[PDB]
Design a protein around this ligand. Structure first.
Ligand code: WN1
Ligand code: ZN
Ligand code: ZN
Ligand code: ZN
Length: 461
């Protein structure tokens, strides 16, 4: 059971208003045939247009919500809506486009999907809340067949051109008119009571219903993300490398060690309360400090209430006011004043961050992590942590060209003494690169208000 069997049953109740008289007993095989697609028995890597929930989750980067509202089906114009916010009107003669025939509409579909997905995925997964018109309109912009490779590269083919009789991936499809071998999943098959709006609105107040096809397409993908990443969490699903994942993760580790090592040196806290990942290790293993861990998995729904993290039932809680609290990606509602905090900004635009549910986002780097909406009020007791580099390693080169470094934020013995050595200048530039990478990925750093880098200079006495 790797793929979805075409002989699986498809509940057709959601399809009977657009398709009155639809048989109650229906397989994917018959539905695909009814949609105009002839599979001709093909063992070539594309066994079904429809996929399982498990396969949809593994391909979350490919998700595109799709809804079709029948404005007036071959007689009446259809409004095509995508979770990109695009609305295309197709005539058979929140970006709203005027009524145009299918031959030109299909060119716009290929362009939009290619520009949206070329850096995210090797495919498209149309996420539906199927009522009928969306499935029967697919034949107007979709071609299917054996799995293929791009005419210009080795990537999987996602588009086909009737003008050149050629196939292309999302990167080489300019001017192509057909979506080739797409995937699709119907959320309505998962067993919901009531319509799309009522189920979506139970978990999200950010997507309204301005009564356009894109509003439903956005709500559909959002409800799917809630089901697969908010109420259900699977951190064992490994995701491919599509960008700066490795550099970002390495930068996070370097920044964490730097900031924690410096706060401990500057304010000599006797104890550190490490609140977050149950699998975390000491980021500063040489520090004197009493290191105490508290397990709290990444919250995918709402940010943790600081009160419930301290909630100890019939026993006493550990004192948090003693020493410093470290919250490295531990999303809470309001941090204590004695904290070192790394909070992901869900609003960041990137290929790793996908739109999520109720203001939150789905950060996909090796694993998928739905993160609750970034809330500036969480940090009222803290200040933004300024960039600085700290080093107490000996001034020794060991060796890339060089230009003299002049920086007030290079906290080293050599800078104190009047001139940064080449080694600390190379390490400062590498650290600043890592720092910028982590900030640009969407992470924000916060610290207790008494934090002052001036206190680091006296560690060179
Ligand atoms: C010092 O900072 C923290 C941070 C987070 C949690 C605790 C704590 O003591 N929690 C606790 C204790 C006994 C039973 C259940 C619990 F959740 C202390
Ligand atoms: Zn290509
Ligand atoms: Zn939503
Ligand atoms: Zn130096």
């Amino acid at each position: 059971p790797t793929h979805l069997s075409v002989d699986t049953k498809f509940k057709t109740e959601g399809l009977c208003v657009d398709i009155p008289g639809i048989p109650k007993d229906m397989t994917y095989r018959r539905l695909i045939s009814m949609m105009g697609f002839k599979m001709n028995y093909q063992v070539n890597g594309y066994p079904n247009m429809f996929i399982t929930r498990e396969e949809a989750i593994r391909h979350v980067r490919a998700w595109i919500g799709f809804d079709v509202e029948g404005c007036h089906g071959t007689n009446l114009p259809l409004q095509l809506g995508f979770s990109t916010g695009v609305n295309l009107v197709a005539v058979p003669t929140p970006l709203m486009y005027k009524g145009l025939p299918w031959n030109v509409v299909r060119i716009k579909i290929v362009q939009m999907l290619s520009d949206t997905l070329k850096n995210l995925s090797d495919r498209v997964v149309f996420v539906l809340w199927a009522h009928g018109f969306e499935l029967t309109s697919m034949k107007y912009f979709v071609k299917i067949g054996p799995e293929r490779t791009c005419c210009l590269c080795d990537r999987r083919a996602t588009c086909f051109s009737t003008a050149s009789d050629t196939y292309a991936c999302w990167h080489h499809s300019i001017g192509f008119d057909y979506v080739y071998n797409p995937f699709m999943i119907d959320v309505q098959q998962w067993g919901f009571t009531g319509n799309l709006q009522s189920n979506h609105d139970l978990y999200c107040q950010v997507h309204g219903n301005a009564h356009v096809a894109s509003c439903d397409a956005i709500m559909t993908r959002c409800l799917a993300v809630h089901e697969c990443f908010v109420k259900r969490v699977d951190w064992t699903i490994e995701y491919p490398i599509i960008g700066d994942e490795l550099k970002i993760n390495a930068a996070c580790r370097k920044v964490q060690h730097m900031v924690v090592k410096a706060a401990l040196l500057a304010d000599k806290f006797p104890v550190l309360h490490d609140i977050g990942n149950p699998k975390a290790i000491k980021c500063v293993p040489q520090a004197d400090v009493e290191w105490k861990f508290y397990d709290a998995q990444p919250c995918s729904d709402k940010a943790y209430k600081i009160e419930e993290l301290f909630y100890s039932y019939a026993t006493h809680s550990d004192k948090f006011t003693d020493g410093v609290c470290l919250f490295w990606n531990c999303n809470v509602d309001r941090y204590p004043a004695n904290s070192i905090v790394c909070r992901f900004d869900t609003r960041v635009l990137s290929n790793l961050n996908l739109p999520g549910c109720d203001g939150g986002s789905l950060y996909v780097n090796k694993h998928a992590f739905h993160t609750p909406a970034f809330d500036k009020s969480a940090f009222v007791n803290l200040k933004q942590l300024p960039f600085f580099y700290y080093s107490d390693s000996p001034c020794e080169s060991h060796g890339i060209d060089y230009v003299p470094l002049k920086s007030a934020t290079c906290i080293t013995r050599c800078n104190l003494g009047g001139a940064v050595c080449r080694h600390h200048a190379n390490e400062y530039r590498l650290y600043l690169d890592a720092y910028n990478m982590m900030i640009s990925a969407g992470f924000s750093l916060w610290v207790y208000k008494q934090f002052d880098t001036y206190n680091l200079w006296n560690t060179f006495t």
